[PDB]
Amino acid sequence: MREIVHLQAGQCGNQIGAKFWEVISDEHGIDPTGTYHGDSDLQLERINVYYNEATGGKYVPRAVLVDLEPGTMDSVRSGPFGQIFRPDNFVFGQSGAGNNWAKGHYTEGAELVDSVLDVVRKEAESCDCLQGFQLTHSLGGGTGSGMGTLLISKIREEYPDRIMNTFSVVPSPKVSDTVVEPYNATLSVHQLVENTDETYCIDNEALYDICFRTLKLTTPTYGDLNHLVSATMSGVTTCLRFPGQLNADLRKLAVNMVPFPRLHFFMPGFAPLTSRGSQQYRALTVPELTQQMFDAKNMMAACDPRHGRYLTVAAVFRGRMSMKEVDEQMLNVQNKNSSYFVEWIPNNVKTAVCDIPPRGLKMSATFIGNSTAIQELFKRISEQFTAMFRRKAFLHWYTGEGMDEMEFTEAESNMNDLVSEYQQYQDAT
């Protein structure tokens, strides 16, 4: 019907996917063996979206795990859900990129991209009518950001009319995890601008703050951050797996949101995030959903609204709720805050209501928002890159691997004109 082939490139992509498939299998009643023990018949009607059929009534995901070094996939395999993947889908090589975009894009990814292209051609053509692909990766690394965009470049030419989503993890303003991270960021953004229809910007300490303040967890883990990203990635595609009073797939969210084919970088958000001790201090209604949805402390990016203007906002609801309440909340949130929404678009909120919440919750919501204030991510990345590149700070680890300075120059100029275009649509009559 409408199937999604899920790609995960790099250590960040593999560790995100290892939790994404766990939360999806718990949502669809799939055990670690791979069988089905669902309590309702609605959990298997649309199991062909993510799961392929096997002999003996077994369900395997449409996952392609890509890594330059097989090190992270021992931890992926040894986990609780590591044995549900088909072993032919694991693609790996001999050496790693070592946080080098150039190595994983030119020298080490050029011979590993063929096997991945074969496995995605085999997986994509076992489908009835493919809707689109899906990539999870990070922009600061070398394999997930170098190979992760070569994959999109090769896939887009073969499938030019499908959906390419990228749940990317963007670099961090306060402290980093990679010294050469601005180079990888500016190189990967230049590919992500042309080659994707939807891109999700996810910041790490946005997740850290969310866990420490809105969840009030004393000691988190990267597993909790991956759970947040998995929950905000499952709720986007929840209207094409369950029925509802208003349906919206990936293409309906893409058409309603991007007004121009460049402004496709968004802000995720998950609204029912209760505290560890403050569950009894709330009366769960739709106004609290909207209030925690639009609170600027609840975004998944370190860049904020109230410095820019919302262009389009998505709101995918889950649960049995009334539609007058949802509609009046979205009317109030635009009317009462009339300066952070653009004036040339009369309605900036697209709403979708499904029927089945996540298991254990009564209602749910998933913010997706196109803001003109995403550009301070790109502005800061450009400032860090113009600090590093002008003095050839680490360029010899790239130019000796068959790169050229012109490629960094394209990668910077494209982001700078994207910043200029966001500024032009920031203020307009």
Binding site: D118, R121, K122, E125
Partner: peptide
């Protein structure tokens, strides 16, 4: 362009290269 009995050939829209050549009808 495809190559033969590969997954890129049985595709909604593909071009498949033919067999290379033969030996006769040309001088040795």
């Amino acid at each position: 362009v495809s190559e033969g009995f590969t997954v890129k050939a049985m595709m909604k829209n593909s071009v498949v290269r033919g067999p290379p050549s033969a030996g006769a009808f040309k001088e040795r």
